[PDB]
Ligand binder design. Sequence first.
Ligand SMILES: *C(=O)c1ccccc1OP(=O)(O)OCc1ccccc1
Length: 106
Amino acid sequence: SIQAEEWYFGKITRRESERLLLNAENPRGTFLVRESETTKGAYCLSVSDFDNAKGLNVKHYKIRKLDSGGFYITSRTQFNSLQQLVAYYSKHADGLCHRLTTVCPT
Ligand SMILES: *C(=O)c1ccccc1OP(=O)(O)OCc1ccccc1
């Protein structure tokens, strides 16, 4: 089901996620989910941001998945699915650079 998600890019590198997100047309919150390069079993949420100090830039957030079933960036805020995690962060910025807006174009 995760592999079926249009925002799930699978096995792409961190640099590739940055190449895709650093497009001048991408508004704040453009995002994608990929596998972590070095953490087995973990995903990575790559998100674009923009401000006058840094200009267009990218942030990465590790998503952990417990055998017990929960998905989360912070253990205080867990979800029953990756889909629910993405939906929540599309409404709440919380500690992220921006709420998730649009799926990163390829
Ligand atoms: C996403 O998993 C993530 C989160 C924060 C920094 C980088 C990052 O991408 P990774 O593909 O996991 O690889 C780089 C990394 C650097 C430092 C610690 C963990 C991952």
